[PDB]
Design an enzyme around this catalytic site. Sequence first.
Site, PDB file in Angstrom:
ATOM      1  N   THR A 158      -6.304   3.573  -2.168  1.00 39.34           N
ATOM      2  CA  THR A 158      -6.819   2.374  -1.786  1.00 39.34           C
ATOM      3  C   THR A 158      -8.097   1.416  -2.309  1.00 39.34           C
ATOM      4  N   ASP A 203      -0.628   0.092  -5.211  1.00 38.50           N
ATOM      5  CA  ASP A 203      -1.730   0.555  -4.821  1.00 38.50           C
ATOM      6  C   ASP A 203      -1.812   1.881  -5.815  1.00 38.50           C
ATOM      7  N   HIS A 204      -1.444   3.096  -5.504  1.00 34.89           N
ATOM      8  CA  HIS A 204      -0.621   3.921  -5.756  1.00 34.89           C
ATOM      9  C   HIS A 204       0.370   4.244  -5.188  1.00 34.89           C
ATOM     10  N   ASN A 240     -23.619   9.791 -23.702  1.00 34.22           N
ATOM     11  CA  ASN A 240     -23.851   8.786 -22.250  1.00 34.22           C
ATOM     12  C   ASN A 240     -22.882   8.489 -22.017  1.00 34.22           C
ATOM     13  N   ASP A 283       1.176  -1.200   0.258  1.00 39.22           N
ATOM     14  CA  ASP A 283       0.053  -0.292  -0.078  1.00 39.22           C
ATOM     15  C   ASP A 283       0.690   1.492   0.143  1.00 39.22           C
ATOM     16  N   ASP A 334     -21.354   6.034 -29.394  1.00 40.48           N
ATOM     17  CA  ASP A 334     -22.844   6.028 -29.401  1.00 40.48           C
ATOM     18  C   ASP A 334     -23.028   5.450 -30.918  1.00 40.48           C
ATOM     19  N   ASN A 362     -13.156   5.320  -2.010  1.00 41.68           N
ATOM     20  CA  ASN A 362     -12.907   5.350  -0.499  1.00 41.68           C
ATOM     21  C   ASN A 362     -14.246   4.868   0.327  1.00 41.68           C
ATOM     22  N   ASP A 399     -20.162  10.716 -27.771  1.00 48.63           N
ATOM     23  CA  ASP A 399     -20.204   9.814 -26.321  1.00 48.63           C
ATOM     24  C   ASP A 399     -21.680  10.635 -25.101  1.00 48.63           C
ATOM     25  N   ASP A 445     -20.434   6.908 -21.719  1.00 46.62           N
ATOM     26  CA  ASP A 445     -19.884   5.245 -21.392  1.00 46.62           C
ATOM     27  C   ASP A 445     -18.867   4.570 -21.778  1.00 46.62           C
TER      28      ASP A 445
HETATM   29  C1  LIG Z   1     -15.174  -2.154 -19.244  1.00 46.61           C
HETATM   30  O1  LIG Z   1     -15.075  -3.900 -19.234  1.00 46.61           O
HETATM   31  C2  LIG Z   1     -16.054  -4.087 -19.051  1.00 46.61           C
HETATM   32  C3  LIG Z   1     -16.551  -5.591 -18.704  1.00 46.61           C
HETATM   33  O2  LIG Z   1     -16.646  -5.793 -20.186  1.00 46.61           O
HETATM   34  C4  LIG Z   1     -17.454  -2.628 -20.057  1.00 46.61           C
HETATM   35  O3  LIG Z   1     -18.710  -3.153 -18.995  1.00 46.61           O
HETATM   36  C5  LIG Z   1     -19.432  -4.025 -20.048  1.00 46.61           C
HETATM   37  O4  LIG Z   1     -20.157  -3.124 -20.734  1.00 46.61           O
HETATM   38  C6  LIG Z   1     -21.262  -4.029 -21.485  1.00 46.61           C
HETATM   39  C7  LIG Z   1     -21.558  -3.134 -22.549  1.00 46.61           C
HETATM   40  O5  LIG Z   1     -22.388  -1.722 -22.218  1.00 46.61           O
HETATM   41  C8  LIG Z   1     -22.281  -4.234 -20.456  1.00 46.61           C
HETATM   42  O6  LIG Z   1     -23.096  -5.633 -21.010  1.00 46.61           O
HETATM   43  C9  LIG Z   1     -24.596  -4.525 -21.053  1.00 46.61           C
HETATM   44  O7  LIG Z   1     -24.650  -6.077 -19.630  1.00 46.61           O
HETATM   45  C10 LIG Z   1     -26.451  -6.039 -19.126  1.00 46.61           C
HETATM   46  C11 LIG Z   1     -25.853  -6.938 -18.106  1.00 46.61           C
HETATM   47  O8  LIG Z   1     -25.080  -6.940 -17.323  1.00 46.61           O
HETATM   48  C12 LIG Z   1     -25.312  -7.858 -16.291  1.00 46.61           C
HETATM   49  O9  LIG Z   1     -24.133  -8.875 -16.623  1.00 46.61           O
HETATM   50  C13 LIG Z   1     -23.267  -8.484 -16.227  1.00 46.61           C
HETATM   51  C14 LIG Z   1     -22.496 -10.308 -16.336  1.00 46.61           C
HETATM   52  O10 LIG Z   1     -22.181 -10.641 -15.579  1.00 46.61           O
HETATM   53  C15 LIG Z   1     -22.770  -7.888 -15.128  1.00 46.61           C
HETATM   54  O11 LIG Z   1     -20.885  -7.278 -15.096  1.00 46.61           O
HETATM   55  C16 LIG Z   1     -23.610  -6.690 -14.682  1.00 46.61           C
HETATM   56  O12 LIG Z   1     -22.346  -5.895 -14.194  1.00 46.61           O
HETATM   57  C17 LIG Z   1     -23.446  -4.323 -13.956  1.00 46.61           C
HETATM   58  O13 LIG Z   1     -23.861  -3.897 -13.060  1.00 46.61           O
HETATM   59  C18 LIG Z   1     -24.134  -4.682 -11.734  1.00 46.61           C
HETATM   60  C19 LIG Z   1     -25.827  -3.554 -11.423  1.00 46.61           C
HETATM   61  O14 LIG Z   1     -25.822  -2.395 -11.742  1.00 46.61           O
HETATM   62  C20 LIG Z   1     -22.872  -3.929 -11.564  1.00 46.61           C
HETATM   63  O15 LIG Z   1     -23.077  -4.182 -10.092  1.00 46.61           O
HETATM   64  C21 LIG Z   1     -21.458  -4.056 -11.798  1.00 46.61           C
HETATM   65  O16 LIG Z   1     -21.085  -3.321 -11.158  1.00 46.61           O
HETATM   66  C22 LIG Z   1     -21.609  -3.112 -13.383  1.00 46.61           C
HETATM   67  O17 LIG Z   1     -21.799  -2.626 -13.658  1.00 46.61           O
HETATM   68  C23 LIG Z   1     -21.247  -1.538 -14.680  1.00 46.61           C
HETATM   69  O18 LIG Z   1     -22.092  -1.786 -15.605  1.00 46.61           O
HETATM   70  C24 LIG Z   1     -23.558  -1.207 -15.881  1.00 46.61           C
HETATM   71  C25 LIG Z   1     -23.417  -1.686 -17.370  1.00 46.61           C
HETATM   72  O19 LIG Z   1     -23.972  -3.118 -17.800  1.00 46.61           O
HETATM   73  C26 LIG Z   1     -23.496   0.335 -15.777  1.00 46.61           C
HETATM   74  O20 LIG Z   1     -24.424   0.577 -15.755  1.00 46.61           O
HETATM   75  C27 LIG Z   1     -22.564   0.225 -14.409  1.00 46.61           C
HETATM   76  O21 LIG Z   1     -22.628   2.282 -13.992  1.00 46.61           O
HETATM   77  C28 LIG Z   1     -21.339   0.080 -14.376  1.00 46.61           C
HETATM   78  O22 LIG Z   1     -20.559   0.672 -14.281  1.00 46.61           O
HETATM   79  C29 LIG Z   1     -24.990  -6.399 -14.900  1.00 46.61           C
HETATM   80  O23 LIG Z   1     -24.909  -7.198 -13.303  1.00 46.61           O
HETATM   81  C30 LIG Z   1     -27.877  -5.665 -19.857  1.00 46.61           C
HETATM   82  O24 LIG Z   1     -28.761  -5.621 -19.776  1.00 46.61           O
HETATM   83  C31 LIG Z   1     -26.703  -5.148 -21.019  1.00 46.61           C
HETATM   84  O25 LIG Z   1     -28.511  -5.310 -22.630  1.00 46.61           O
HETATM   85  C32 LIG Z   1     -28.759  -4.219 -22.730  1.00 46.61           C
HETATM   86  O26 LIG Z   1     -28.326  -2.758 -23.631  1.00 46.61           O
HETATM   87  C33 LIG Z   1     -27.887  -3.626 -24.966  1.00 46.61           C
HETATM   88  C34 LIG Z   1     -27.441  -2.328 -25.605  1.00 46.61           C
HETATM   89  O27 LIG Z   1     -26.098  -3.152 -26.374  1.00 46.61           O
HETATM   90  C35 LIG Z   1     -29.201  -3.930 -25.257  1.00 46.61           C
HETATM   91  O28 LIG Z   1     -29.210  -4.430 -26.474  1.00 46.61           O
HETATM   92  C36 LIG Z   1     -30.189  -5.264 -24.311  1.00 46.61           C
HETATM   93  O29 LIG Z   1     -30.989  -5.225 -25.138  1.00 46.61           O
HETATM   94  C37 LIG Z   1     -30.345  -4.471 -23.263  1.00 46.61           C
HETATM   95  O30 LIG Z   1     -30.983  -3.095 -22.963  1.00 46.61           O
HETATM   96  C38 LIG Z   1     -32.363  -2.826 -22.486  1.00 46.61           C
HETATM   97  O31 LIG Z   1     -32.052  -2.472 -21.144  1.00 46.61           O
HETATM   98  C39 LIG Z   1     -31.360  -1.280 -21.140  1.00 46.61           C
HETATM   99  C40 LIG Z   1     -31.425  -0.848 -20.121  1.00 46.61           C
HETATM  100  O32 LIG Z   1     -32.076  -1.469 -18.550  1.00 46.61           O
HETATM  101  C41 LIG Z   1     -32.546  -0.619 -21.639  1.00 46.61           C
HETATM  102  O33 LIG Z   1     -32.895   0.592 -22.356  1.00 46.61           O
HETATM  103  C42 LIG Z   1     -33.532  -1.351 -23.107  1.00 46.61           C
HETATM  104  O34 LIG Z   1     -34.936  -0.752 -24.173  1.00 46.61           O
HETATM  105  C43 LIG Z   1     -33.778  -2.632 -22.903  1.00 46.61           C
HETATM  106  O35 LIG Z   1     -34.671  -3.054 -22.668  1.00 46.61           O
HETATM  107  C44 LIG Z   1     -25.747  -5.083 -21.744  1.00 46.61           C
HETATM  108  O36 LIG Z   1     -25.421  -5.946 -22.571  1.00 46.61           O
HETATM  109  C45 LIG Z   1     -21.737  -5.012 -19.553  1.00 46.61           C
HETATM  110  O37 LIG Z   1     -22.361  -5.440 -18.353  1.00 46.61           O
HETATM  111  C46 LIG Z   1     -20.498  -4.605 -18.674  1.00 46.61           C
HETATM  112  N1  LIG Z   1     -19.703  -5.243 -17.582  1.00 46.61           N
HETATM  113  C47 LIG Z   1     -19.468  -4.771 -16.791  1.00 46.61           C
HETATM  114  C48 LIG Z   1     -19.042  -5.984 -15.667  1.00 46.61           C
HETATM  115  O38 LIG Z   1     -19.658  -3.071 -16.247  1.00 46.61           O
HETATM  116  C49 LIG Z   1     -16.938  -1.795 -19.987  1.00 46.61           C
HETATM  117  O39 LIG Z   1     -17.824  -1.044 -21.381  1.00 46.61           O
HETATM  118  C50 LIG Z   1     -15.203  -1.257 -20.366  1.00 46.61           C
HETATM  119  N2  LIG Z   1     -14.829  -0.093 -20.431  1.00 46.61           N
HETATM  120  C51 LIG Z   1     -14.876   0.449 -21.826  1.00 46.61           C
HETATM  121  C52 LIG Z   1     -14.387   1.870 -21.750  1.00 46.61           C
HETATM  122  O40 LIG Z   1     -14.357  -0.024 -22.470  1.00 46.61           O
HETATM  123 CA    CA Z   2      -3.509   2.282  -0.351  1.00 49.59          CA
HETATM  124 CA    CA Z   3     -21.602   6.113 -25.530  1.00 47.56          CA
HETATM  125 CL    CL Z   4     -13.317   8.446  -2.213  1.00 42.54          CL
HETATM  126 ZN    ZN Z   5      -3.285   5.830   2.375  1.00 35.30          ZN
END
Ligand SMILES: *[C@@H]1O[C@H](CO)[C@@H](O[C@@H]2O[C@H](CO)[C@@H](O[C@@H]3O[C@H](CO[C@H]4O[C@H](CO)[C@@H](O)[C@H](O[C@H]5O[C@H](CO)[C@@H](O)[C@H](O)[C@@H]5O[C@H]5O[C@H](CO)[C@@H](O)[C@H](O)[C@@H]5O)[C@@H]4O)[C@@H](O)[C@H](O[C@H]4O[C@H](CO)[C@@H](O)[C@H](O)[C@@H]4O[C@H]4O[C@H](CO)[C@@H](O)[C@H](O)[C@@H]4O)[C@@H]3O)[C@H](O)[C@H]2NC(C)=O)[C@H](O)[C@H]1NC(C)=O
Ligand code: CA
Ligand code: CA
Ligand code: CL
Ligand code: ZN
EC number: 3.1.4.39
Length: 806
Positions: A159, A308-309, A685, A121, A691, A180, A683, A687
């Site tokens: 961390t 970590d940093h 939204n 750490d 887009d 944190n 972009d 993400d």
């Molecule tokens: C970095 O790498 C990561 C990993 O590859 C990339 O993130 C992925 O991006 C994918 C594309 O956007 C995304 O895919 C979506 O998944 C949805 C289901 O996801 C659930 O299951 C997975 C698998 O186990 C899980 O990982 C997810 O976990 C997320 O959410 C939980 C609870 O919120 C969190 O605890 C967890 O930390 C994580 O959150 C993060 O991601 C979510 C998005 O999923 C963000 O909202 C958070 O802020 C946070 O960043 C989930 O449990 C699936 O439902 C999606 O499908 C919808 O959208 C597509 C569009 O293509 C559409 O075709 C489908 O029909 C569907 O749409 C429907 O729902 C919409 C919304 O409700 C609605 O508008 C429509 O009308 C439809 O009803 C989609 O496939 C994937 O989940 C994440 N994975 C992770 C781990 O984040 C990331 O992009 C990379 N970043 C870069 C810069 O490259």
């Molecule tokens: Ca630390």
């Molecule tokens: Ca976007």
């Molecule tokens: Cl913080």
């Molecule tokens: Zn510290």
Amino acid sequence: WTATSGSCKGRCFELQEVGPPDCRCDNLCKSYSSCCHDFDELCLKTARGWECTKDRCGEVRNEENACHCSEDCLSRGDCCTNYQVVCKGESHWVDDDCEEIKVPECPAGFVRPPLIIFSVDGFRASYMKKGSKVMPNIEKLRSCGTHAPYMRPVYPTKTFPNLYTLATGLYPESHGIVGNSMYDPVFDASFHLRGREKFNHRWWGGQPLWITATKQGVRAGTFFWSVSIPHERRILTILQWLSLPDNERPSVYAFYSEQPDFSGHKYGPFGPEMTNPLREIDKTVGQLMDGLKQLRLHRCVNVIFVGDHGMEDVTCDRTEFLSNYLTNVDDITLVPGTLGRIRAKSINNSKYDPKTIIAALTCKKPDQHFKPYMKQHLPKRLHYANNRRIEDIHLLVDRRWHVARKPLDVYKKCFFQGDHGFDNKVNSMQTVFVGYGPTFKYRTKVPPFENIELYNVMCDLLGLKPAPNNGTHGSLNHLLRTNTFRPTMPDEVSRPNYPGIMYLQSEFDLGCTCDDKVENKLEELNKRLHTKGSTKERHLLYGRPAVLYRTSYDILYHTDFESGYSEIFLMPLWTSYTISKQAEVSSIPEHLTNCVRPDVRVSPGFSQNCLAYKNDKQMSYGFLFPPYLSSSPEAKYDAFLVTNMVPMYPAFKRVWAYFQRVLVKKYASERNGVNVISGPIFDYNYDGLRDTEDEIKQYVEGSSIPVPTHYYSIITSCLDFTQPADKCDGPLSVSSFILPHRPDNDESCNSSEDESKWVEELMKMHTARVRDIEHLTGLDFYRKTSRSYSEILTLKTYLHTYESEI
Ligand SMILES: *[C@@H]1O[C@H](CO)[C@@H](O[C@@H]2O[C@H](CO)[C@@H](O[C@@H]3O[C@H](CO[C@H]4O[C@H](CO)[C@@H](O)[C@H](O[C@H]5O[C@H](CO)[C@@H](O)[C@H](O)[C@@H]5O[C@H]5O[C@H](CO)[C@@H](O)[C@H](O)[C@@H]5O)[C@@H]4O)[C@@H](O)[C@H](O[C@H]4O[C@H](CO)[C@@H](O)[C@H](O)[C@@H]4O[C@H]4O[C@H](CO)[C@@H](O)[C@H](O)[C@@H]4O)[C@@H]3O)[C@H](O)[C@H]2NC(C)=O)[C@H](O)[C@H]1NC(C)=O
Ligand SMILES: [Ca+2]
Ligand SMILES: [Ca+2]
Ligand SMILES: [Cl-]
Ligand SMILES: [Zn+2]
Ligand SMILES: O=C(OCc1ccc(OC(F)(F)F)c(F)c1)N1CCc2cc(C(=O)N3CCc4[nH]nnc4C3)nn2CC1
Ligand code: NA
Ligand code: NA
Ligand code: NA
């Protein structure tokens, strides 16, 4: 409630966690207040200390001892780590010459080399050089193994976000540990360093390494240690786990040290009190390596030494107070310190306005030590926006400083001399990486890389398939002797059209004009060839980018530049051109000031129009290939084609014009030619991903011309700058940026001054990896080079930081 009247007899540091109210004996039971009554007695033995002495050698086994020096201890797997040195005349690991480890040299029954992650750490990257005199074990790992000069953490450089990024390969916005401290508005719950809520699994997204391993049949040690377990006991526990029967023995392990971070907060990164913590960490590493040697595992195990940093000098007197800026201070909640996050104190307060708060915090004091941002305007390289736990209002705090709400928060809630959390490009926040073992290379230095890449590598080391993550798999293949990951280039999804001349001037009614009607087989055969792609080899150096999604687009060739023109978004997705060291800058001729020309290869219906720009009082336009860099007066006409035009706010045109008129030439001079690929990014939204057309929130008034949120450029030259960019025989050099397309220059407090005083500073702040641009555009670059794909992936993950030397 826990029925703490069970027993830890033979269960000490059990690998499977038992479900309450059954009492626990795992390395986390303390943290949950759930250990059995005898956990301390049986599992945290201290008697006789941690080292064998001459007279303890050969002793009769006394189970009360912390570790053992008896004859049977090696077979029991529980000798003090220095047993063989003291009693059997062995040398310490550190006193042995290092010798290349070409193959794993493991005891029979080991199916794979184990991986041990030794995480520290607050271990600042410059400690490797600056503390090297007092860290001989770590210095041996570093010089004999594979090492980077530093490793880039993620933002914020705290961390939890960083350790979880190490375990998952994800940005905090994706893994969900975004600080944190956090409030999640959907849960309506808060997460804190101290307390129970952080143990709830709903906070922790993605798939950490121990879960990836477990699911794929690779056994994992428990990664987390309660703070009160001393470091010597953590090491002996790991060493004991390594003595388990083949069917029970984990393949992956983690050790954690709260040092040097703990002392760094108190004494600053280089306080004289910091020497002792670095010595003690080195002694711990020594204990591991001696223990491994005893077990005949020192040429079998892969060891990662990772931080970590870093840590920066920060004191109470360097605090900015929001109370010196806001009249409404009590209506906000601030997450404070080395970053700021602001939300409304009450969701019932309808007079809360983020726009007026941001304005009150913008460029208000001469040397203001923080800058406010709406989160979607933060530099894209931070990837810090796409999570509901990240407040809309963010403060990027200058290194060495804190932000707080009110002075009373600082003296009623100086103590500290160090802190961390700042922008992850800051030198003081950089941390360390060393890899040592049969799978890492021998005596090899690798370039700095980001910690989001490590998850993939740790998966490679264990033969695991990584969960989807933000690393670029293959980009760290050069760290490894074997187990490399050999990816293939993504397949192009859309093929381009190559339109010829198909429209007459008079079919266009775009409201555009150009003084170009001023009139030969020398120059007409010539211009046709340019339009068929005769100069394409000069301007498209690494092949055309591949389009990785379904869309409709045209390749347009010109003397000076080539573009992939989107019929859907009505502008290029990319424009490519090469500017030699010798190239000359010219002006836009007076008669061409407002010239826009129809492109006879592209239908009116797939073109922009000038009337929309005239009508839109907020929006103007610029060009992707700059007219300033035309190769000749006749070639200049090409730069005014309506297909080279893009929407730009006047405020942004200031930025863009200076980059195009001044900076491109400057880089060509300094880098011996540059190849430039520029284009729009959408972009809305935030993400980090391209887009779709239905996600666009803004158009040029009265038209279907979508407004980019950002403009990128990728600037490539020869790493050996004695070779010109267009004639490079070896490795490439790149820098890129993703500039926010904003209607004001509020971000730059000096923008009332000449572009030479603020624009380059803006661009440096918005530095980017090619990989960031790929995510944002669905394009795949460097498809045709003479370089290995792994080398190109490394190039794509490169970030030009503009920090001075570490
Ligand atoms: C970095 O790498 C990561 C990993 O590859 C990339 O993130 C992925 O991006 C994918 C594309 O956007 C995304 O895919 C979506 O998944 C949805 C289901 O996801 C659930 O299951 C997975 C698998 O186990 C899980 O990982 C997810 O976990 C997320 O959410 C939980 C609870 O919120 C969190 O605890 C967890 O930390 C994580 O959150 C993060 O991601 C979510 C998005 O999923 C963000 O909202 C958070 O802020 C946070 O960043 C989930 O449990 C699936 O439902 C999606 O499908 C919808 O959208 C597509 C569009 O293509 C559409 O075709 C489908 O029909 C569907 O749409 C429907 O729902 C919409 C919304 O409700 C609605 O508008 C429509 O009308 C439809 O009803 C989609 O496939 C994937 O989940 C994440 N994975 C992770 C781990 O984040 C990331 O992009 C990379 N970043 C870069 C810069 O490259
Ligand atoms: Ca630390
Ligand atoms: Ca976007
Ligand atoms: Cl913080
Ligand atoms: Zn510290
Ligand atoms: O044992 C642990 O973690 C092992 C590990 C090691 C490596 C891991 O990931 C990897 F394997 F992938 F590397 C990986 F997930 C997990 N932990 C988690 C880390 C931690 C933080 C604190 C803490 O209270 N502070 C942190 C420093 C700080 N600075 N300012 N304020 C603070 C407050 N206490 N602990 C002890 C328990
Ligand atoms: Na004309
Ligand atoms: Na306009
Ligand atoms: Na300004």
